Amino acid sequence: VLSPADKTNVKAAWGKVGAHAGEYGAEALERMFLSFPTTKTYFPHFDLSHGSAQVKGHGKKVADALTNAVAHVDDMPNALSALSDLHAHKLRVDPVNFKLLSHCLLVTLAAHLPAEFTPAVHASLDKFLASVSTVLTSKYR
Amino acid sequence: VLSPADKTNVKAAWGKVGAHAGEYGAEALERMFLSFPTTKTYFPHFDLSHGSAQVKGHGKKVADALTNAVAHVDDMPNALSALSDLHAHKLRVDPVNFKLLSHCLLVTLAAHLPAEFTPAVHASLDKFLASVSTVLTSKYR
Amino acid sequence: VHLTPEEKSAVTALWGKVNVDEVGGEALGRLLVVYPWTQRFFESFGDLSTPDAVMGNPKVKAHGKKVLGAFSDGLAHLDNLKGTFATLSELHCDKLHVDPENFRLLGNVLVCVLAHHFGKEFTPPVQAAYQKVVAGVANALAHKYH
Amino acid sequence: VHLTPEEKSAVTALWGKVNVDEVGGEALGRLLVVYPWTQRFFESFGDLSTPDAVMGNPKVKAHGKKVLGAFSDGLAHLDNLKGTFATLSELHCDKLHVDPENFRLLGNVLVCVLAHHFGKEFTPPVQAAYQKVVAGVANALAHKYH
């Protein structure tokens, strides 16, 4: 459950991603695939090489989904219902993998947004990504 | 995130619990303290002996809190805000302990209500307790 | 895993009443229902689309019997679980890459099934003994991760 | 932990640039802020009431130095993390009863702090090598649970 301060912090921090959405999302995916190779199992027919245009394209989708979550942060299950059906019903992604990607998103934001990534904002981003993860791993239709 | 059918399952099952709510809360606590002795560190001054009136009294509080949560299943953060502050802010309970108590509640329900504890109801109750746990381990003031 | 003589006696007494043809399938089936991502590991098992489909699926029941057999074997080798389960650990960790939290979940679903079947016999002390056992088995299955 | 010579070189080179006096405190402090229940283990440390109080707390900074020292000891002997951390495992597991998920959390907070400090130099391959290290350290700290 996010505090009002959490929502403020997330909107401010994530708001700085802007046109770097694809770039940052792709970097977070690449970090996940490299650091935690078991995650590659969910993408059996992807080109997961360094600099892959396919990962770049997927990175933009993930980042844009996070933008969607921010714009609906008080009512996320209804805003992400399509993504929950994909990840929980169709793909059956083990919840641990969301902790791994969330961590890699935090690493990416820490590496690109040093002034924004204060301990308080770090805390809020972690809670936000955990909330998004809970929605995407739940079946609630 | 609970489905509409999850909420119905939880309400139906906890209703069958009815007047035994308190007895079951006490039993779940006893099960937790015995099965997972580390949990006793949160109750350093308690009489934790079998039959303890103090544990029985506390089991009733826990059960009544769950009954309140069931009654406000659509609005649990608001309904449980005081309890969240207690467990997350004051007591600083490690989230693993909520998984342990939730399991012991399921075990208690299974032992007393075997006909009611179908696989679908088991699933909904597990999700419900996970949802309660997430609220009680969140600081969101 | 060390059990007191009292715990060992109580564990053995309860296990003797377990239906070895059914309880493993009930535990596996409830794992697939309660934690649905676990179904990804059993894509070849056919219909897992509803709780009724899962619980009545012949391949779930048959596989469950093997799982129960591993728990039964473990009960006879509680001081050497890492040894006993070495082949299964290599399978679940190195080949299947099952996240080890799921081993903990299955052990606790098994405990719930024992509670369901044995009610008042599944006392808190009996449960505590079984939690030692299923934690031991989960830890031994996860050994390749440690 | 098995690092390639290339991975070990990358890790060692970066660690040579890590501020011995500050980075452990930054990681411990962020653990306390991001995962507040961990504060329960540090009652005697005084004021942990706000993020600024935590990060400015002298005892957090001082204790963080010790934590960093232990990671450093791990890096010095990657082939014997279990032995290096045996006394610390007894403390954290047997005495303090820290749930071992928290060891994973602290390792990942350290990784975030390295990324924060070094920016683009903390490449995905450098991270992957560090993830092997912090996973090995968490496993060694948790050895008494296994």
Ligand code: HEM
């Ligand atoms: C913050 C967490 C996540 C977000 C916001 C997210 C978002 C998305 C989005 C927007 C899509 C594309 C949906 C579409 O094409 O309509 C997608 C697809 C997908 N995601 Fe995620 N995802 C997350 C976590 C994960 C994780 C942890 C995994 C597995 C390790 C995963 C596996 C997949 C797969 C396999 C696809 C489909 C790829 C394909 O075959 O086209 N997701 N996700």
Ligand code: HEM
């Ligand atoms: C379903 C999850 C839980 C529920 C519904 C719940 C509910 C409650 C309630 C109603 C109270 C009494 C509040 C008051 O009257 O002031 C309480 C107190 C307390 N709870 Fe929980 N609780 C849960 C989980 C836990 C867990 C997992 C732990 C630790 C292992 C824990 C540790 C405590 C402690 C230490 C107290 C205060 C006891 C005292 O010193 O008086 N709770 N809880």
Ligand code: HEM
């Ligand atoms: C924690 C206690 C567990 C025990 C005692 C156990 C035991 C077993 C046994 C005896 C086998 C048969 C091995 C063989 O035929 O050589 C097996 C296979 C398997 N297990 Fe488990 N297991 C456990 C947990 C899990 C979990 C949580 C999963 C998650 C999905 C899992 C996934 C599998 C799969 C996919 C197979 C192979 C099925 C096939 O033949 O297609 N296991 N397990």
Ligand code: HEM
């Ligand atoms: C995962 C990597 C960790 C490392 C490398 C580490 C390292 C250390 C070291 C070197 C000490 C000092 C031991 C001594 O002076 O004898 C210590 C003490 C301690 N650690 Fe950790 N630790 C880790 C994780 C954790 C976590 C996650 C917690 C709690 C959530 C924790 C709680 C404590 C406490 C309470 C003390 C004693 C503080 C006191 O003296 O009052 N540790 N640790």
